[PDB]
Design a protein around this ligand. Structure first.
Ligand SMILES: *SC[C@H](NC(=O)CC[C@H](N)C(=O)O)C(=O)NCC(=O)O
Length: 241
């Protein structure tokens, strides 16, 4: 996250860190039930040197605050039994950039570990709404990755504006969230984490999955996120949640 601040400890108890063994923190995820996380499909694509698609390569940390303190009280360590990437995921366009991760053992709910709420398929996150992005990604483009979880407040951008800012790149699964002026944005290593939206009684719903951007925090280049409501039924079908 560029332009953000240190989160308070336990502030985002649905934010999860995914480490690939020997590679450190690679992406974020969100806790949605005792057994399931939502993340970004593009995080789990093999390259010639590492099989990111193999669930056995991964560790999820729940209740994590500081990457240098992974054994701190209340942090829960879990393996993955399965990665379900969206069948329509495209590694060139990043369309359908969403995956479901099955924990090998259930999370224990606590003050530090709590699921985010899922929005119904009919819910619209309106243009202009303030939303929060969180993660341990870079704090400057080409920069480096934060030890302490970062938070930044960003706003939903109108889809037509989004399409025009990033021509031939924005599908209806995608949403721009940020500022046309730049300044606050997700960045490398934030991929897969949740957008957190404060809803009508203060409960927090997931409004998206961190996906991609052109640089970070640049003018006219807000971050791109996978939308959540359109995947509500897909989530239910595949997880029971
Ligand atoms: S909608 C998901 C979260 N709800 C809960 O954690 C309460 C029910 C639990 N499933 C349980 O302990 O049984 C939630 O409200 N998260 C968002 C928030 O703002 O806290």
């Amino acid at each position: 996250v560029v332009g953000g601040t240190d989160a308070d400890e336990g502030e985002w108890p649905w934010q999860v860190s995914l480490h690939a063994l020997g590679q450190g923190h690679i992406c974020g995820a969100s806790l949605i039930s005792p057994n399931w996380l939502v993340s970004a499909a593009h995080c789990y694509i093999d390259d010639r040197g590492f099989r990111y698609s193999d669930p056995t390569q991964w560790t999820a940390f729940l209740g994590l605050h500081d990457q240098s303190q992974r054994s701190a009280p209340g942090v829960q360590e879990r393996r993955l039994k399965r990665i379900i990437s969206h069948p329509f995921f495209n590694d060139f366009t990043f369309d359908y950039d969403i995956a479901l991760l099955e924990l090998e053992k259930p999370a224990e709910y606590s003050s530090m570990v709590r699921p985010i709420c899922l929005p119904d398929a009919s819910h619209v996150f309106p243009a202009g709404k303030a939303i929060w992005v969180t993660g341990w990604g870079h704090t400057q483009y080409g920069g480096t990755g934060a030890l302490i979880l970062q938070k930044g407040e960003i706003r939903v951008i109108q889809q037509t504006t989004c399409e025009n800012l990033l021509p031939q790149q924005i599908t209806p699964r995608m949403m721009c969230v940020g500022f046309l002026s730049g300044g606050v944005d997700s960045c490398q290593g934030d991929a897969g984490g949740p957008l957190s939206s404060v809803e009508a009684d203060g409960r927090i719903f997931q409004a998206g999955v961190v996906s991609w951007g052109d640089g970070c925090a640049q003018r006219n280049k807000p971050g791109v996120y996978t939308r959540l409501p359109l995947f509500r039924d897909w989530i239910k079908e595949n997880t029971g949640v």
